Amino acid sequence: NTPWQGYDINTNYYETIPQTNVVREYWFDIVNTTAALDGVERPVLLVNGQFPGPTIEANWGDTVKVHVTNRMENNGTAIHFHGIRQLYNNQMDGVAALTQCPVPPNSSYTYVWRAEEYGSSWYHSHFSLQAWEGVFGGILIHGPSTAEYDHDLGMVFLNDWSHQTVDEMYQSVLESQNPPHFQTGLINGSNIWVTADNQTVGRRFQTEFVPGQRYRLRLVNAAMHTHFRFSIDNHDLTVIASDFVPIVPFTTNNVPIGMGQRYDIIVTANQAPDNYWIRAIPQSFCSDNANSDNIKGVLHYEGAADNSDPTSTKWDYGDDIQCLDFSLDELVPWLALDADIGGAQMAESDVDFTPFGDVPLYLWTMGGNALNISWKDPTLQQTFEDPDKMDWKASQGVIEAAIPNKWTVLVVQTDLPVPHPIHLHGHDFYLLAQGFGQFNPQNVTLKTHNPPRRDTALMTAATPENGGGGYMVIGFPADNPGVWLIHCHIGFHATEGFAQQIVERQSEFNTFFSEDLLENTCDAWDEYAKVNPYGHQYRALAGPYESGI
Ligand SMILES: *[C@@H]1O[C@H](CO)[C@@H](O[C@@H]2O[C@H](CO)[C@@H](O)[C@H](O)[C@H]2NC(C)=O)[C@H](O)[C@H]1NC(C)=O
Ligand SMILES: *[C@@H]1O[C@H](CO)[C@@H](O[C@@H]2O[C@H](CO)[C@@H](O)[C@H](O)[C@H]2NC(C)=O)[C@H](O)[C@H]1NC(C)=O
Ligand SMILES: *[C@@H]1O[C@H](CO)[C@@H](O)[C@H](O)[C@H]1NC(C)=O
Ligand SMILES: [O-][O-]
């Protein structure tokens, strides 16, 4: 009686996709505008004048077709659909410098992809810091669920926020050893703001419950530099999926959610009819936010007082310091799959933060190098011009996975007391290990029996007082030819160099590749760069360094 009739929660979505014959077609203008999301006016870049951008909605098995037209004047654009597998469809992944040139003002790009997973994610620009000026929106793919509920509330975005744009902050961030500071936050694009005169402008997010009913909230952390704990005073939360992977449901009183990650939760309306605070609390070990305790929304029961703030108390779950994921034991995919890593290629990418040049600028290095690649010469252009290319520069940050279905096991490690959300394109990886301190190849234990599986996980780090450092280990099979970004999801870090490209099954790129799709946009882009100085990529060390993204 569903659009995926004949399939269900135990279907292996990596191997089988419902045939729906339906195409969901969107049209996205990327616009240069202003908004007062917490009652203070500021410039924003948005999809169709909205924040968050409109939700892309589809059923499992549909095809989605998104026309993106750049209506801005001084940025290119490219849209990435986060967590979408893009199996044999790498050129639709929307990564400038990898899969395409950026789309210039007054040009378009049509993304087409298959909904070959179900649950919750998001699309966002993958061009420089653009996603965090506002170019992002939900993806909501209907499908089976590991628990029942009554109403689907759709996306719930969590964002940090300042009244200066991230682009305005960037030069300061490049030149500083300290992490960036933000003034406030938004819950699905809303908050109040308290002015210097103690006026309240703006409006808080608010949602309304009927007593007894069960609600699905699809949380997404779209922040630039904040790891949050999300909670609802007095209400427990049943987690039912992490990223695009349904899991064995479990109940908790808060959700720790890093950048790029999603969790689906079911909240039952089982408390006294009242107003309760919804809280999105930046974790202070890796977030610096002036208003940690005032990024709140309002859960309003029918039967509660109207026009009246909650007086509920926060769940006493501990402190709001460390930046942590749910544990490996907590996240058990419903579809059980083992990490078959015998014969895997082993790699390690170290993470460091290093000064460069005379200023200096502080860049993040992954695998030994700050990524330094070219918007106008994308990796797929390089491999089209030279199919057997082997001369990768250190600055291209390459990791090869040349053999079909061979596993890679990648350890991402740091000595620094700084945790990072790692995102891999083109794949759900198997999260084998996450931990603190030094990585111990003799001692570490790798979880291979139905490990958590998802597309974004933290490289956790110890605090300075505990010696700093940490690591995560993922595995994935080479099941998807393409050039796939793996990088830190913090927009400032990635732009500063924290990224590597997986060159997967290079001899099979002609399986998906289209020179016309690449060159049309590349020619448009060069035409724009000839007339507009924002068309040239700044890659030197005395201005706003762009890794290529
Ligand atoms: C959005 O529009 C503003 C203009 O309102 C652009 O900013 C201006 O950029 C020009 C460069 O063409 C500067 O000479 C002006 O000083 C800028 N004005 C302000 C208010 O800073 C901005 O570049 C646009 N952004 C995009 C992405 O197109
Ligand atoms: C990032 O890479 C580019 C190479 O594409 C570097 O720029 C070149 O550097 C040489 C010598 O340093 C210059 O003389 C060339 O004119 C530069 N070419 C371009 C295209 O700008 C750049 O220095 C690198 N940046 C970092 C931080 O290493
Ligand atoms: C948040 O915003 C999206 C996009 O506008 C919307 O579809 C969704 O309903 C919102 N979520 C809630 C819970 O209001
Ligand atoms: O996806 O970043």
Ligand SMILES: [Cu+2]
């Ligand atoms: Cu993303």
Ligand SMILES: [Cu+2]
């Ligand atoms: Cu980072």
Ligand SMILES: [Cu+2]
């Ligand atoms: Cu990415």
